Design a protein around this ligand. Sequence first.
Ligand SMILES: Nc1nc2c(ncn2[C@@H]2O[C@H](COP(=O)(O)OP(=O)(O)OP(=O)(O)O)[C@@H](O)[C@H]2O)c(=O)[nH]1
Ligand SMILES: [Mg+2]
Ligand code: NA
Length: 342
Amino acid sequence: HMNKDNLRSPICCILGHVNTGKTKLLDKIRQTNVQEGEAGGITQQIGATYFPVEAIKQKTAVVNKDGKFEFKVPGLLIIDTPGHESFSNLRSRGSSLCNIAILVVDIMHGLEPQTIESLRLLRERKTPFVVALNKIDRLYGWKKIENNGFRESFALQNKAVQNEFRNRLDQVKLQFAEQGFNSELFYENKNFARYVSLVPTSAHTGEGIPDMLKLIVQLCQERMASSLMYLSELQATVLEVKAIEGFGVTIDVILSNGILREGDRIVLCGLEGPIKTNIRALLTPAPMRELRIKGQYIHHKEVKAAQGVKISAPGLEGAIAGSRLLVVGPDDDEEELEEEVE
Ligand SMILES: Nc1nc2c(ncn2[C@@H]2O[C@H](COP(=O)(O)OP(=O)(O)OP(=O)(O)O)[C@@H](O)[C@H]2O)c(=O)[nH]1
Ligand SMILES: [Mg+2]
Ligand code: NA
């Protein structure tokens, strides 16, 4: 059960106050422009992006130059969430699905109200998280090197910029302490298991993103329960029901554990009772592309967890967002499963 063909990709949520740079960070990693396409420049839905470990290794190379950091995960599913205050339901849903998280804090503003909301969500579930202390390019006089590691860029800054960085860092540390979190600049953290690491980033220049990606792998590998590194019983959650061209009424699903297969008999909650149907198409986006954006879909015979998938199947009208989804196995009674899922 701990075999290479049984590794699980964990789930990381991004959380943070409105406009702190959650989507912009993911756009820099993906090399996409989702944020520019958003109405109002604000995220209004949960979005999912799968990052294969190959891509993570490449995007952390500048802080792993000798190639010796050991990557154990096969990849990571990252769930983007709204910061706008009206979407607390979606932050709660995203937080409930993740195994680890990134909390984005604008270094220029510190902790803000939806930061405090997000901290309550993280606290409640004992979720391991790192803080992306974002927007460092706004420190006055910041000199960038695109996609550099933070420490190498920080060493090239003038004294005023270094002073300003430390002043803002010390303020944010105090704010975290007021909320009951002891936090450390990531390379000053001597207790990774119990203290929150602060990793300075810019989504505009890419600086510090290599450090942030390395740290979330370290969260998976060193803080997340080790059992969650491997696949066990299926767990899946409906995010949305949506009509799309050619496929009809589909569901978007976060596959949290186990394996889904084309043709599977699935059961889930509907407005009038359980829905029982068969997967006609099991779809994902391309790697490093979003689920919440229309694009061309990849069809799979099999999808291993975690992933964001789109399922086409008859009868999904009235599927309920937040519903669990189960697969009828050989030893299952299809009617008995209907009752379990609700
Ligand atoms: N200068 C600078 N601007 C940034 C950075 N990150 C994000 N921004 C800007 O901040 C604004 C908000 O960015 P978003 O990516 O929408 O932030 P978000 O946290 O995803 O916002 P919501 O999802 O709406 O809560 C945009 O204008 C970004 O270009 C950064 O590192 N530096
Ligand atoms: Mg966003
Ligand atoms: Na925004």
